[PDB]
Design a binder for this molecule. Structure first.
Ligand SMILES: *[C@@H]1O[C@H](CO)[C@@H](O)[C@H](O)[C@H]1NC(C)=O
Ligand SMILES: *[C@@H]1O[C@H](CO)[C@@H](O)[C@H](O)[C@H]1NC(C)=O
Ligand SMILES: *[C@@H]1O[C@H](CO)[C@@H](O)[C@H](O)[C@H]1NC(C)=O
Lengths: 136, 50, 233
C-alpha cells in the first residue's frame, strides 16, 4: 500500500584491518580459554598488557571505517586525530555511557578518536504497487 | 542512557563483550554465553519499549 | 599525632581518559577524615636517634613525606622483615629510584652519611626508575593486588596541609607476587593512613584531570551526592 515503511538498516562496512613491537613472563611473545589457539590473544600477565601472542603490525589507516586491534582492544570504527589531552599514564578514553571513544596508538603514541562508522534506518517510499513499482 | 549502559552488563556472563566470548570459548560454550547476553539485552529492550 | 582531619589520598583508579564527567567507582581509598598517624615517633627524635617502628600494611597504605631536604630515603615492604622471606626494598637515589626484592635483616635500621647497606640476598626482580627530586609534598599510595605491587604518587611543589585537591598519579606497576603484611619506613615527618574499600565520586575535567572527589560513606550529604552523581544537590 502507499506509504513509507521501515524495512531494514544501512551500515557502512570496514574495508581493511589495523594491527598494532617486541619479537623476544614479560616482554616476550607468547606461544580461561578453551580453544587450542591462544596466539591471537593478549594476556595481561593466563589471566585475561604484555606477553601477547604473535601478530604482524600494519599501517595506521585514518578517516575510514576500519577493524582495529590496539594491544588487545578491538573494534570497528573511524579513526581520526584527537584533540583530547591524555595523561601519559592513560591508554584509552571513555564516554559518559562507558563506551570506548579514544585510544593511543601503541607505536608513536598518537591519540586517536574513534567515531563509529555511520548506520541508520532504511525507509522505503512506495506509491503503491497498484500504481507504480518505482520506489524511493 | 539506561538502555545503552545495559550493554556493558554481563548478566552472569564471562564477559560483556561478544567478541571476547567468541575469541575465548569454543563455539559449543560460546553459544551458551552469547545466549545469556542475548537474554539480558532482549530483556533490556523489552523494558525500554514497555 | 592522630592528625584525623585529613582528606587526601585520592588516585586515578585506572589508565582511562575521561572528559568533564563524574565517575562513581568502588576501589581501595583512604577514607576522608580518617586517622592519619603523624610521625615525636620518628627515630631521629626518639630514643637515642633510633627505632622508627614497623607499621602494618592493611590492604594498602597511604604515606606522605613532608621533608623538603629529602632526608627520607625509602621503604621495606614484607612480613617478618628479618631475612626469613623476601621483602621489597624501594630506595630513592639522588639520580634514580632503585627497587630490590632481596631478603636481609638490616639496612638503615641498626648523624650524616648514614650507611644504607644490607645483605641484599636472593633477588628475583630489580627495577630502576626516575628520581623523586622551597617546599614540596611527596604523596605516595602503596596498593597490592594478587600478583602486583602498585605505587601511585604525586610530587606537589605547603607548610599547611589543607591545600587544594590533587589526585595521585600511578608511578610504577610492579608484577611482584610478594606477600606483604608489615612495612618499615627508612629515614636515614611522616603521615601514614590505611586504605579501605569505598565508593568515591570522582570529578574529571575537560583535560581529564581529577579535580574533586566525594567519599560516599563519610556523611549523609556525600551519600546523596553519590546517589545523584553530582557535587551539587
Ligand atoms: C617500537 O615501539 C616504540 C614504542 O614507544 C616506538 O617508539 C618505536 O618507534 C617502535 N619502533 C619503530 C621502528 O617504529
Ligand atoms: C602471608 O604471610 C602471613 C604471615 O603471618 C601468612 O599468615 C599468610 O598466610 C601469607 N599469605 C600468603 C598468600 O602467602
Ligand atoms: C588543558 O591544559 C592546557 C595546558 O596548557 C590549557 O592551556 C588548557 O586551557 C586546558 N584546558 C581545559 C579545558 O582546562
Amino acid at each position: 500500500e502507499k506509504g513509507i515503511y521501515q524495512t531494514s538498516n544501512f551500515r557502512v562496512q570496514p574495508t581493511e584491518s589495523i594491527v598494532r613491537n617486541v619479537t623476544n613472563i614479560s616482554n616476550c611473545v607468547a606461544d580461561g580459554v578453551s580453544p587450542t589457539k591462544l596466539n591471537d590473544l593478549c594476556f595481561t600477565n593466563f589471566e585475561l598488557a604484555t606477553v601477547c601472542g604473535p601478530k604482524k603490525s600494519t599501517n595506521l589507516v585514518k578517516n575510514k571505517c576500519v577493524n582495529f586491534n590496539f594491544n588487545g582492544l578491538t573494534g570497528t570504527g573511524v579513526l581520526t586525530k584527537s584533540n583530547k589531552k591524555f595523561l601519559p599514564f592513560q591508554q584509552f578514553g571513555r564516554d559518559i555511557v562507558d563506551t570506548t571513544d579514544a585510544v593511543r596508538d601503541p607505536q608513536t603514541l598518537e591519540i586517536l578518536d574513534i567515531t563509529p562508522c555511520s548506520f541508520g534506518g532504511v525507509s522505503v517510499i512506495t506509491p503503491g504497487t497498484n500504481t507504480s513499482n518505482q520506489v524511493a | 542512557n539506561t538502555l545503552v549502559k545495559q550493554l556493558s552488563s554481563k548478566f552472569g556472563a564471562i564477559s560483556s563483550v561478544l567478541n571476547d566470548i567468541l575469541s575465548r570459548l569454543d563455539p559449543p560454550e560460546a553459544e551458551v554465553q552469547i545466549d545469556r547476553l542475548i537474554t539480558g539485552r532482549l530483556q533490556s529492550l523489552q523494558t525500554y519499549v514497555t | 599525632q592522630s592528625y584525623t582531619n585529613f582528606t587526601r589520598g585520592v588516585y586515578y583508579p585506572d589508565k582511562v581518559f575521561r572528559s568533564s564527567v563524574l565517575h562513581l567507582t568502588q576501589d581501595l581509598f583512604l577514607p576522608f577524615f580518617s586517622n592519619v598517624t603523624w610521625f615525636a615517633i620518628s627515630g631521629t627524635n626518639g630514643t637515642k636517634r633510633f627505632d622508627n617502628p614497623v607499621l602494618p600494611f592493611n590492604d594498602g597504605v597511604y604515606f606522605a613525606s613532608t621533608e623538603k631536604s629529602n632526608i627520607i630515603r625509602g621503604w621495606i615492604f614484607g612480613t617478618t622483615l628479618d631475612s626469613k622471606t623476601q621483602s621489597l626494598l624501594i630506595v630513592n637515589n639522588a639520580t634514580n629510584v632503585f627497587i630490590k626484592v632481596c631478603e636481609f635483616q638490616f639496612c638503615n635500621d641498626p648523624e650524616s652519611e648514614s650507611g644504607v647497606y644490607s645483605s641484599a640476598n636472593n633477588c628475583t626482580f630489580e627495577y630502576v626508575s626516575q628520581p623523586f627530586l622551597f617546599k614540596n609534598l611527596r604523596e605516595f599510595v602503596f596498593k597490592n593486588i594478587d600478583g602486583y605491587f602498585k605505587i601511585y604518587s604525586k610530587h606537589t611543589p605547603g607548610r599547611d596541609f589543607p591545600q587544594g585537591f590533587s589526585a595521585l598519579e600511578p608511578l610504577v606497576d610492579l608484577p611482584i607476587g610478594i606477600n606483604i603484611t608489615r612495612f618499615q619506613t627508612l629515614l636515614a615527618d611522616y603521615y601514614v593512613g590505611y586504605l579501605q574499600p569505598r565508593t568515591f565520586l570522582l570529578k574529571y575535567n575537560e583535560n581529564g584531570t581529577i579535580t574533586d572527589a566525594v567519599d560516599c560513606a563519610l556523611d549523609p550529604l556525600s551519600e546523596t551526592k553519590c546517589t545523584l552523581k553530582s557535587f551539587t544537590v
